[PDB]
mmCIF file of C-alpha atoms and ligand atoms in Angstrom:
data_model
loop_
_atom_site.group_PDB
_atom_site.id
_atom_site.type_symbol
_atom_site.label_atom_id
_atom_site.label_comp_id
_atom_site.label_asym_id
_atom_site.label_seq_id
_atom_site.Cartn_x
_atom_site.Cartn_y
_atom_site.Cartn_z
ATOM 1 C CA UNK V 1 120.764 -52.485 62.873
ATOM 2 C CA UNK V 2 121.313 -52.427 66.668
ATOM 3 C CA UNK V 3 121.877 -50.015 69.137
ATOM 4 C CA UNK V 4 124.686 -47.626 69.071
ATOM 5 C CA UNK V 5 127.439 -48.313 71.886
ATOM 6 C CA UNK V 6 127.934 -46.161 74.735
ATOM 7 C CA UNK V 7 130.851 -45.605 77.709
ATOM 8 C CA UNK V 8 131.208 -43.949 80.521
ATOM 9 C CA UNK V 9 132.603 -40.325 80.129
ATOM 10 C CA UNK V 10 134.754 -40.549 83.301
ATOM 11 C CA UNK V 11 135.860 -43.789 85.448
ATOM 12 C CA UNK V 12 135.856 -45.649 82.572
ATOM 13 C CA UNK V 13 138.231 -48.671 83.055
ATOM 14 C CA UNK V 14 138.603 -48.529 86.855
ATOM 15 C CA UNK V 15 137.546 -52.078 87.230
ATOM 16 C CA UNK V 16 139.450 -53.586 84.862
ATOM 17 C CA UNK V 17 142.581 -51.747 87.082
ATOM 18 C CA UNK V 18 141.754 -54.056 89.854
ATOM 19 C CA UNK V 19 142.636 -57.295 91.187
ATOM 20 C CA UNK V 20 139.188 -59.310 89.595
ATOM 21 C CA UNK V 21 138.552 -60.508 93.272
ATOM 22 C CA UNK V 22 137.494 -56.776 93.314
ATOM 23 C CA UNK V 23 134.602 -57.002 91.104
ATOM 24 C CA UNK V 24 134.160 -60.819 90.347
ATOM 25 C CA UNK V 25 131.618 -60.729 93.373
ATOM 26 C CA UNK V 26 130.252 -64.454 92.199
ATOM 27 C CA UNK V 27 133.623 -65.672 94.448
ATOM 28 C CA UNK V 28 133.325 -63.135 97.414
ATOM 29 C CA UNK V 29 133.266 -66.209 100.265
ATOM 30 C CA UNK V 30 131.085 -64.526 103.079
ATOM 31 C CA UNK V 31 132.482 -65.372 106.870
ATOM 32 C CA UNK V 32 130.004 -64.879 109.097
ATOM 33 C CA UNK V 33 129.412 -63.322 112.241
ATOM 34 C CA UNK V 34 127.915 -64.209 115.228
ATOM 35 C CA UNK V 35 124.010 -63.877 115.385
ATOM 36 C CA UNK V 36 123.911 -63.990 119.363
ATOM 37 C CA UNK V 37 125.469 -61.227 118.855
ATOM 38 C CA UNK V 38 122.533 -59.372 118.161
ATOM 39 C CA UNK V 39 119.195 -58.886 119.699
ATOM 40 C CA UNK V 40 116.226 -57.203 117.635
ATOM 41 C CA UNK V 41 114.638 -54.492 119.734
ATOM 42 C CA UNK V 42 111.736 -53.323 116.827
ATOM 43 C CA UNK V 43 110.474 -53.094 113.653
ATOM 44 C CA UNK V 44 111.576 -49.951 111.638
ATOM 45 C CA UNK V 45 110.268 -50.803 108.178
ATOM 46 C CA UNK V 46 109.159 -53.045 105.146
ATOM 47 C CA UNK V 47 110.304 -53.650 102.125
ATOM 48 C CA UNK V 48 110.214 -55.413 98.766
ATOM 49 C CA UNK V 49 113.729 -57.009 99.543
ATOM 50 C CA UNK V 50 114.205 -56.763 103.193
ATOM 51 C CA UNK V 51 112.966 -56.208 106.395
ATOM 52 C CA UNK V 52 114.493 -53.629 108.766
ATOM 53 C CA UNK V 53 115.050 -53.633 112.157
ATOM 54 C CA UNK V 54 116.603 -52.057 115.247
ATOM 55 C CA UNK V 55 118.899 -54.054 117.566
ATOM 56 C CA UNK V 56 121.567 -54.024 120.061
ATOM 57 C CA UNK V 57 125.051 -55.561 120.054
ATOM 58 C CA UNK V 58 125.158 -57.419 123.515
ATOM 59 C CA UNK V 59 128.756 -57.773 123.087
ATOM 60 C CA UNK V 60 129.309 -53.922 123.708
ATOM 61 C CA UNK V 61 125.887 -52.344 124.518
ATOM 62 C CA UNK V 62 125.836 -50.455 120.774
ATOM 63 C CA UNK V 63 122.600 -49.828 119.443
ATOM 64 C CA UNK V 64 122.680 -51.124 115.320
ATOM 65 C CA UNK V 65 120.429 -51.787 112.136
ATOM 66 C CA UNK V 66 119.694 -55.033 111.038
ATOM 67 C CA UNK V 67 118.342 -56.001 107.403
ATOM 68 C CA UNK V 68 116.824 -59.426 107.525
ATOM 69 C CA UNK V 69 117.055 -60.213 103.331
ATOM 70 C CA UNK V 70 114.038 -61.710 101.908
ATOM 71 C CA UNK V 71 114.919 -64.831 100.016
ATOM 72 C CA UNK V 72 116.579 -63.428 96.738
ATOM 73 C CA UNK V 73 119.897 -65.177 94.062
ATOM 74 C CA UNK V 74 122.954 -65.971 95.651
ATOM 75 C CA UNK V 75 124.815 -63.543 93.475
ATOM 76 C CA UNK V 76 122.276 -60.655 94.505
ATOM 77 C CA UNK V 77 123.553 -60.977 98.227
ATOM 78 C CA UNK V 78 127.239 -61.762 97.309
ATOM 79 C CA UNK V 79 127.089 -58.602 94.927
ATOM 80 C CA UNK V 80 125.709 -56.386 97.717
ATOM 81 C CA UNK V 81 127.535 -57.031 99.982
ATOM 82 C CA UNK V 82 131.007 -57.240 98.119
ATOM 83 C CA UNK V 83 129.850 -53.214 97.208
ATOM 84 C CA UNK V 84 129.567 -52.537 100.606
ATOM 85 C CA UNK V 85 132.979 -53.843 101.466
ATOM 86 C CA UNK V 86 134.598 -52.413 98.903
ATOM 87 C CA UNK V 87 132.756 -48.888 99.759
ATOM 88 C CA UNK V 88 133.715 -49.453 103.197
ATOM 89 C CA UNK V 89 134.970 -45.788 104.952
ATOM 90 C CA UNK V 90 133.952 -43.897 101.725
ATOM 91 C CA UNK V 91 132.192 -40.278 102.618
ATOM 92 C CA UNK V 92 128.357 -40.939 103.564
ATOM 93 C CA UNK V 93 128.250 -44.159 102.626
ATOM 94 C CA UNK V 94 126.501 -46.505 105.357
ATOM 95 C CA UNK V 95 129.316 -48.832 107.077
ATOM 96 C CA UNK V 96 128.477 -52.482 106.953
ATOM 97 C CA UNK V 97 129.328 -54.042 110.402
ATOM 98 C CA UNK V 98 128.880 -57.357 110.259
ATOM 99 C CA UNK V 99 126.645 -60.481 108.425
ATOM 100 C CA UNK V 100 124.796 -63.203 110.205
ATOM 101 C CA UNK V 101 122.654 -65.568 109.452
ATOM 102 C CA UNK V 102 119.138 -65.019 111.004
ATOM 103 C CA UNK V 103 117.938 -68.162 113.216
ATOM 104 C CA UNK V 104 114.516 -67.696 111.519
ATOM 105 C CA UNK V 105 114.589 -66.555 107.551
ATOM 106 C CA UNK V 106 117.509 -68.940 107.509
ATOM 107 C CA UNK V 107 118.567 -66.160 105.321
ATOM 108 C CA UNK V 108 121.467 -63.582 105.521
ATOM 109 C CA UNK V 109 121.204 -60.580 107.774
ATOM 110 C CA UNK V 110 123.006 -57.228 106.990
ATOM 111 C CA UNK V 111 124.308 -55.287 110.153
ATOM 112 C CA UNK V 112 124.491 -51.572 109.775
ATOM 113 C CA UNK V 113 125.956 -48.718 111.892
ATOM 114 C CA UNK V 114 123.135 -47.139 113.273
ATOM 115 C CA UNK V 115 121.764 -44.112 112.020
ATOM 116 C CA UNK V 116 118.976 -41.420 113.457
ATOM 117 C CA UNK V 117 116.588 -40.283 110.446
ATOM 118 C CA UNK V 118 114.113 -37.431 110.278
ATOM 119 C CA UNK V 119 112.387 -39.237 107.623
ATOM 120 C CA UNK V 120 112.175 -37.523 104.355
ATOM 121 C CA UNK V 121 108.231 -37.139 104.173
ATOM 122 C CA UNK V 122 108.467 -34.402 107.181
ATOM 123 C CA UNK V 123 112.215 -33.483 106.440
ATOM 124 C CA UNK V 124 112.156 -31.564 103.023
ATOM 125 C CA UNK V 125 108.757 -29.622 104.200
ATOM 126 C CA UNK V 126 111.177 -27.868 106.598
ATOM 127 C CA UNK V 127 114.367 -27.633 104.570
ATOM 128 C CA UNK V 128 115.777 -24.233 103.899
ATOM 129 C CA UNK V 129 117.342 -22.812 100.849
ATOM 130 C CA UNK V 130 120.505 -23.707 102.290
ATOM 131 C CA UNK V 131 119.991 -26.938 103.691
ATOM 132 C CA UNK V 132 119.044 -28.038 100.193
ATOM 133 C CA UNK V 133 122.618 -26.934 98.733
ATOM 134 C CA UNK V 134 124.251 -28.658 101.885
ATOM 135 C CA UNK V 135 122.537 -32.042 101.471
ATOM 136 C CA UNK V 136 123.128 -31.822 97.576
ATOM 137 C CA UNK V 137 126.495 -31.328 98.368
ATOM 138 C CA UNK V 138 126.723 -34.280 100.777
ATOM 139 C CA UNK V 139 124.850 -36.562 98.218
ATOM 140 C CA UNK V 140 127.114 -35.914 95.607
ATOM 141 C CA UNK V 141 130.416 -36.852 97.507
ATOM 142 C CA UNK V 142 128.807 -40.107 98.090
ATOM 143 C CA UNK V 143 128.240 -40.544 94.195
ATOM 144 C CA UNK V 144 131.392 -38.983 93.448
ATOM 145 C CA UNK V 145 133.866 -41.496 95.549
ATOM 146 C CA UNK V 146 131.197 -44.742 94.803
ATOM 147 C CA UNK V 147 131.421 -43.560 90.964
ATOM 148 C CA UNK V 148 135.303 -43.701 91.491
ATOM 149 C CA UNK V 149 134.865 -46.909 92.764
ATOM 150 C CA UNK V 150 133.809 -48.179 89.968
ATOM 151 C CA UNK V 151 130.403 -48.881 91.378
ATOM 152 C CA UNK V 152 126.886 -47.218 90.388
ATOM 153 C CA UNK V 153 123.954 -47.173 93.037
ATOM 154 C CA UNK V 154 121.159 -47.342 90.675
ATOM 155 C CA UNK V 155 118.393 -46.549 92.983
ATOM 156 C CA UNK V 156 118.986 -42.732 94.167
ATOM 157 C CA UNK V 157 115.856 -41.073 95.836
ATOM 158 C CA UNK V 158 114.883 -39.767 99.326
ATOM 159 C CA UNK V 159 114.133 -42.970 101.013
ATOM 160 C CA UNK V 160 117.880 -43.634 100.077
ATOM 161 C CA UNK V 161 119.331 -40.841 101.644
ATOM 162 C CA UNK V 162 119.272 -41.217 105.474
ATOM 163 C CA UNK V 163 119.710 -37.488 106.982
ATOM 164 C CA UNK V 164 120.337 -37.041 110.751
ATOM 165 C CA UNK V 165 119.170 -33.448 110.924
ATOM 166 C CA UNK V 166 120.307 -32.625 114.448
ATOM 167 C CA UNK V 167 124.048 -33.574 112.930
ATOM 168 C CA UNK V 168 124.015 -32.447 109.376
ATOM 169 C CA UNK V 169 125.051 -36.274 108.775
ATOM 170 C CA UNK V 170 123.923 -38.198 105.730
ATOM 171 C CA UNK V 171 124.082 -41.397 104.693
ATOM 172 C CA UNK V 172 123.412 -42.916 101.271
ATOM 173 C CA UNK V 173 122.049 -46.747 102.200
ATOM 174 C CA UNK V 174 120.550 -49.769 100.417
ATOM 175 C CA UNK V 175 122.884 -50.807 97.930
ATOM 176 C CA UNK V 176 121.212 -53.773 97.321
ATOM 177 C CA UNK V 177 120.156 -52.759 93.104
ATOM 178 C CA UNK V 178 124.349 -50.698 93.118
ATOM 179 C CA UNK V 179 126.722 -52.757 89.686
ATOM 180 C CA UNK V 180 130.099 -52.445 88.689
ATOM 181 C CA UNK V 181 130.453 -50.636 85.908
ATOM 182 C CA UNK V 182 132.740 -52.229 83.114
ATOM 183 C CA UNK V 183 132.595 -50.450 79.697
ATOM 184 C CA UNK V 184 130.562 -52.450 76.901
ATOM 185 C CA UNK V 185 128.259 -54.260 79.350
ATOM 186 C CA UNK V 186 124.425 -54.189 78.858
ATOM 187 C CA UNK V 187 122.693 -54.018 82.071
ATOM 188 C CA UNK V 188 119.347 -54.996 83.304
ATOM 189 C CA UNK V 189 116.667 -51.379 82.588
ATOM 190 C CA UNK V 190 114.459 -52.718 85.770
ATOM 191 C CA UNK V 191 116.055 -50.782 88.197
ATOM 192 C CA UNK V 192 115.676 -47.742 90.444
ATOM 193 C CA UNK V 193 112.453 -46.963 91.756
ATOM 194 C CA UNK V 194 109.496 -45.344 89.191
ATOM 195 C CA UNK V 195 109.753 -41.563 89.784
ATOM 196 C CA UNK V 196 113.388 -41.804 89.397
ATOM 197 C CA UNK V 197 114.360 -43.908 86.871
ATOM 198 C CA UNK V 198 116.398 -42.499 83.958
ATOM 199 C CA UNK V 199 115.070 -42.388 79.936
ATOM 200 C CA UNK V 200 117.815 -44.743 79.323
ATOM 201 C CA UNK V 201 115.358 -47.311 81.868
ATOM 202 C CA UNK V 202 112.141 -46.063 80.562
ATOM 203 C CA UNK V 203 113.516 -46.585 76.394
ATOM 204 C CA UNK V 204 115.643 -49.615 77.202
ATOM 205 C CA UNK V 205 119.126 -48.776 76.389
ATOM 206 C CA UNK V 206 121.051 -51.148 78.316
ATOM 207 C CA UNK V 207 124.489 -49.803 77.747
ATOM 208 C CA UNK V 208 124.001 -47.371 80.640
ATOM 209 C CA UNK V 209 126.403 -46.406 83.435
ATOM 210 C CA UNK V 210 126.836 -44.036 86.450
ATOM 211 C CA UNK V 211 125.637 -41.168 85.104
ATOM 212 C CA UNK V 212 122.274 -43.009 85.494
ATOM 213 C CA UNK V 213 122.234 -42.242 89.262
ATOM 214 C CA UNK V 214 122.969 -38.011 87.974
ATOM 215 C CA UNK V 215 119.241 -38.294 86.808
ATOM 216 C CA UNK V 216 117.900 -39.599 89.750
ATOM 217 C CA UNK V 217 119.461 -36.588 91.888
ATOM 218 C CA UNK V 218 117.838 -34.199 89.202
ATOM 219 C CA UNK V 219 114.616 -35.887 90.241
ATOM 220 C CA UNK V 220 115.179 -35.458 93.820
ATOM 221 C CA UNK V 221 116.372 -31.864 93.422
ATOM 222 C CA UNK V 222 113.980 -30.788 91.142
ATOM 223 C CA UNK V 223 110.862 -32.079 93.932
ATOM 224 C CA UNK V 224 112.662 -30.300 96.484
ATOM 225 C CA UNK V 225 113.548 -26.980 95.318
ATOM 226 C CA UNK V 226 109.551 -26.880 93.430
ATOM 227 C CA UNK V 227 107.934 -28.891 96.782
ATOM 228 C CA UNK V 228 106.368 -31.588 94.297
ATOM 229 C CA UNK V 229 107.692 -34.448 95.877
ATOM 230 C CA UNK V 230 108.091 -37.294 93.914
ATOM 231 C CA UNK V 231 108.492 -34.788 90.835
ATOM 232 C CA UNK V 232 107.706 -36.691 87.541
ATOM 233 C CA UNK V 233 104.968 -38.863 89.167
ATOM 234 C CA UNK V 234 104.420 -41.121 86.323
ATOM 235 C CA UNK V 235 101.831 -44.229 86.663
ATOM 236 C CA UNK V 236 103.734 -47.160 85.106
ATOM 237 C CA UNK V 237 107.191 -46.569 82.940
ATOM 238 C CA UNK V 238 105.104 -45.528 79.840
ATOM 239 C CA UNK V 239 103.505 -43.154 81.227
ATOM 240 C CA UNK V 240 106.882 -42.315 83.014
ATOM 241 C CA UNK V 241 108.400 -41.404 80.095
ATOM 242 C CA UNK V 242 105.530 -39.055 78.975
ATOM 243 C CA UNK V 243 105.638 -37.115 81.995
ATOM 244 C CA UNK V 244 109.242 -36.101 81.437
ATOM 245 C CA UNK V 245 108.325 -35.901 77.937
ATOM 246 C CA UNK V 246 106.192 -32.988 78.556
ATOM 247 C CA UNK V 247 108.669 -31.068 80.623
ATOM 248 C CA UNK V 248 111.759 -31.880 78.476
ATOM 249 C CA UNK V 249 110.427 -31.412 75.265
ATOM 250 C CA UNK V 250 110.333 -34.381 72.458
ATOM 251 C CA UNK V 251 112.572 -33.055 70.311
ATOM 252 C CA UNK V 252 115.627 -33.875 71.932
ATOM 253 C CA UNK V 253 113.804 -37.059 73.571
ATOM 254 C CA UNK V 254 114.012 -37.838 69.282
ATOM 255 C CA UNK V 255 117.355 -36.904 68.935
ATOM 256 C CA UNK V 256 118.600 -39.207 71.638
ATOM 257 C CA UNK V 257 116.680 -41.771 70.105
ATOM 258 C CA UNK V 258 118.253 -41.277 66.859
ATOM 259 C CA UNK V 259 121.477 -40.647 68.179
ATOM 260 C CA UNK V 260 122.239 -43.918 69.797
ATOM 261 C CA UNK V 261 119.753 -45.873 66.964
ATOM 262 C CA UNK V 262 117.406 -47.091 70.382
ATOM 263 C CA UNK V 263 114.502 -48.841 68.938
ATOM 264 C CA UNK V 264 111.441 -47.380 70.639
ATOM 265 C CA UNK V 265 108.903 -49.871 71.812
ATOM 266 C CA UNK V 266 105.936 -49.455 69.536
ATOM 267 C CA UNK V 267 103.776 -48.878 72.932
ATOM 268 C CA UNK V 268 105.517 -45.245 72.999
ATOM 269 C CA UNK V 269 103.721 -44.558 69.067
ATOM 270 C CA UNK V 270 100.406 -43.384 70.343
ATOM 271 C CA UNK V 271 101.441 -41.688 74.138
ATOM 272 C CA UNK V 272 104.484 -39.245 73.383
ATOM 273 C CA UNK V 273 102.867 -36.892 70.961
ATOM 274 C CA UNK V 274 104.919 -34.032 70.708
ATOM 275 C CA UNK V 275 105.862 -31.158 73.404
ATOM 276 C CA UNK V 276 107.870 -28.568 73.428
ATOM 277 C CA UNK V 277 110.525 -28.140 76.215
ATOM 278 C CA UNK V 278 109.123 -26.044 79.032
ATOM 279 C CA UNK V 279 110.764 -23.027 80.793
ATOM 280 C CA UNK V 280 111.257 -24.145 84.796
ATOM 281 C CA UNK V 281 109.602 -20.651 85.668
ATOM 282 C CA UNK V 282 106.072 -22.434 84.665
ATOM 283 C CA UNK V 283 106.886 -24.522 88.195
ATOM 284 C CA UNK V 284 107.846 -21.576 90.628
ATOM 285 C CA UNK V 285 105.132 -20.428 92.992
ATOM 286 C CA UNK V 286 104.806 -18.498 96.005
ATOM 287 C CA UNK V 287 105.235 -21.213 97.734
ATOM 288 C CA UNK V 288 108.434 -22.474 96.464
ATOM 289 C CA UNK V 289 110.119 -19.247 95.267
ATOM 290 C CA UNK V 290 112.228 -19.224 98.261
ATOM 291 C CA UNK V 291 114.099 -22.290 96.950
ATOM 292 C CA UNK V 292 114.386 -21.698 93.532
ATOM 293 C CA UNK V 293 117.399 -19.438 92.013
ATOM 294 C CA UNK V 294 118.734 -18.933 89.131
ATOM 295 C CA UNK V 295 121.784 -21.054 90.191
ATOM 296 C CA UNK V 296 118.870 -23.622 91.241
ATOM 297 C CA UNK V 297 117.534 -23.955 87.857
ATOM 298 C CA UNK V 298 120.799 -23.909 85.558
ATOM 299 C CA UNK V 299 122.124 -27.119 88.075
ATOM 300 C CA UNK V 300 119.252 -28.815 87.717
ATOM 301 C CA UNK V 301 118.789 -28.327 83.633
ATOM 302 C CA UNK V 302 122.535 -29.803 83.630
ATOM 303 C CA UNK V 303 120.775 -33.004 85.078
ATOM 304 C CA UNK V 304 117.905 -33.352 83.303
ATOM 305 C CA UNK V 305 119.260 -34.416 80.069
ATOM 306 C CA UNK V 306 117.893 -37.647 78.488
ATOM 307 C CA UNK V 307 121.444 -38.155 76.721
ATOM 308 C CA UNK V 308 123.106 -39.564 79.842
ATOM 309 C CA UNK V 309 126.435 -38.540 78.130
ATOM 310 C CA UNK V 310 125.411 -35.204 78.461
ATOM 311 C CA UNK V 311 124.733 -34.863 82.290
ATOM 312 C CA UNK V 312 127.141 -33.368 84.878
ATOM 313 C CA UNK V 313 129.733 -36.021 86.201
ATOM 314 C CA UNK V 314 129.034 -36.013 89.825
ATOM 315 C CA UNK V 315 132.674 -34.193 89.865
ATOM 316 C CA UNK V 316 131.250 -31.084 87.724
ATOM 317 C CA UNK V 317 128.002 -30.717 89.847
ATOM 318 C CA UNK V 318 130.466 -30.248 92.475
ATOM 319 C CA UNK V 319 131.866 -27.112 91.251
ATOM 320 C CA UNK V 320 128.666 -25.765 90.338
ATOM 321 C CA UNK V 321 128.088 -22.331 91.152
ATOM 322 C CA UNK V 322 124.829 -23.784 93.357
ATOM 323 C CA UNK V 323 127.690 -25.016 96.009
ATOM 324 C CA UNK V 324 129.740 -21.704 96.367
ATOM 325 C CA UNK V 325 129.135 -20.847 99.625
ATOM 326 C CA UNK V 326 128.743 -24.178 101.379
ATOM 327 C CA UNK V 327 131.783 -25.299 99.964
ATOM 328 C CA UNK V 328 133.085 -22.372 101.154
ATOM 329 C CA UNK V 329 131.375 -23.118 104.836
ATOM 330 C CA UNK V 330 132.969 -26.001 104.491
HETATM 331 C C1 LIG W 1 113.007 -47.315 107.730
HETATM 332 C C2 LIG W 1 114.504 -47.614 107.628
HETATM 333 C C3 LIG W 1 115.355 -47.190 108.678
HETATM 334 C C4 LIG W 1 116.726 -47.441 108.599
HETATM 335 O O1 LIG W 1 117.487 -46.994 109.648
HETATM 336 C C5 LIG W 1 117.289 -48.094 107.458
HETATM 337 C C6 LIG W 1 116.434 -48.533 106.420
HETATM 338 C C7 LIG W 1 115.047 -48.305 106.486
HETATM 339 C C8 LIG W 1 116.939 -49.202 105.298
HETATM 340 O O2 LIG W 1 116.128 -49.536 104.382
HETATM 341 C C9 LIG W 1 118.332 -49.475 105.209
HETATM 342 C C10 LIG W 1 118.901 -50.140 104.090
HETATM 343 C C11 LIG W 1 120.294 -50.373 104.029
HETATM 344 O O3 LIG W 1 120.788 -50.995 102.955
HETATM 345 C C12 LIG W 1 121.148 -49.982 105.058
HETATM 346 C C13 LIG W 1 120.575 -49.325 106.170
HETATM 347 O O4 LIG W 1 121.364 -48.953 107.220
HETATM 348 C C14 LIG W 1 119.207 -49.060 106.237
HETATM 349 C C15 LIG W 1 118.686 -48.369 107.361
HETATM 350 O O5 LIG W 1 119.522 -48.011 108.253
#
């Protein structure tokens, strides 16, 4: 018959609130900056859809980030960048300074705020109990205020999530995959990267919304709190899938099937089998027993749900008991 429809539990109809210029991103005019302006001092990374460099801002000696775009749709840089603006202030999200148009690429250059990361792969081998909670916390008031922007990030994992240790400063960055959310719409399942992409990617159902990006902190907490970093390390998205699978249990991975009437790709027939939902204790060792509470584990289950309408708003992890005493710290 066809999928069963889906909506957001909160933030449902904050877009349609808005003037459309808000969302309607295909008419965002870009005015560009300067690109004088800027001189590159080195390379910081690669990636699929940009290149990333420091530079300086002649004009007033600051040091910034510059993301030289690899040659992608029109609407794909108009939609980024429209998020961006719109996110603009909002807690630990990266501040887009300016856009220019790179002499060389011919093709649009982002200019960030700098920022001053320990980068993740020596970061969470040193993070203590609390620092997890902390960072959590941060994260979360990123998704929270983006969420009640009407905007999802859709690729949440630790590349994502700039940390300046020495401040206790984060920064959620790249934007570049984030949608409006409008209820009813059917989105594109090929985001987010691998290790972190929600069952609602890996069993195509496109009716989808924020709580999409809830999953992808689950995976980030759970390979922090276990040190198994990324967590579900699936192959390909089939084998994605499984890998949860076999934590999760299939029963309820069936149920949420059945529940929204998702027809399962016949691939899946042969590779799910059947699993029983696992205990989290079966992942605690003396290694990582130092991270992992009972307040730990209850958070995380309240993540890991394949029925996205059944995951913590980023509002409810909030209040968790996890958070008690940084938020009272804070
Ligand atoms: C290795 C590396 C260092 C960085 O400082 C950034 C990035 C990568 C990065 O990918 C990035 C993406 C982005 O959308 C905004 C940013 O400020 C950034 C970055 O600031």
């Amino acid at each position: 018959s066809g999928p069963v429809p889906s909506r957001a539990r909160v933030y449902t109809d904050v877009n349609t609130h808005r003037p459309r210029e808000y969302w309607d991103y295909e008419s965002h005019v870009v005015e560009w900056g300067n690109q004088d302006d800027y001189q590159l001092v080195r390379k910081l990374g690669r990636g699929k859809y940009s290149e990333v460099f420091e530079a300086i801002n002649i004009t007033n000696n600051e040091k910034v980030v510059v993301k030289i775009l690899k040659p992608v749709k029109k609407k794909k840089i108009k939609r980024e960048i429209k998020i961006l603006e719109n996110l603009r202030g909002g807690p630990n999200i990266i501040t887009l300074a300016d856009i220019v148009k790179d002499p060389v690429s011919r093709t649009p250059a982002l200019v960030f705020e700098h920022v001053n990361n320990t980068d993740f792969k020596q970061l969470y081998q040193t993070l203590t109990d609390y620092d997890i909670r902390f960072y959590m916390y941060e994260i979360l008031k990123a998704l929270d205020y983006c969420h009640s922007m009407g905007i999802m990030h859709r690729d949440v994992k630790p590349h994502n999530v700039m940390i300046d240790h020495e401040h206790r400063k984060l920064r959620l960055i790249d934007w570049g995959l984030a949608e409006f959310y409008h209820p009813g719409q059917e989105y594109n399942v090929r985001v987010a990267s691998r290790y972190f992409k929600g069952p609602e990617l890996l069993v195509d159902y496109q009716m989808y919304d924020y709580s999409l990006d809830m999953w992808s902190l689950g995976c980030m907490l759970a390979s922090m709190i276990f040190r198994k970093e990324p967590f579900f390390h699936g192959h390909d998205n089939y084998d994605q899938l499984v890998r949860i699978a076999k934590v999760l249990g299939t029963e309820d991975l069936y149920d949420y099937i059945d529940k929204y009437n998702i027809e399962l790709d016949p691939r899946f027939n042969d590779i799910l089998g059947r699993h029983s939902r696992k205990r989290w204790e079966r992942f605690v060792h003396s290694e990582n027993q130092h991270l992992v509470s009972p307040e730990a584990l209850d958070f995380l289950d309240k993540l890991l749900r394949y029925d996205h309408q059944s995951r913590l708003t980023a509002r409810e992890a909030m209040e968790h008991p996890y958070f008690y005493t940084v938020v009272k710290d804070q």
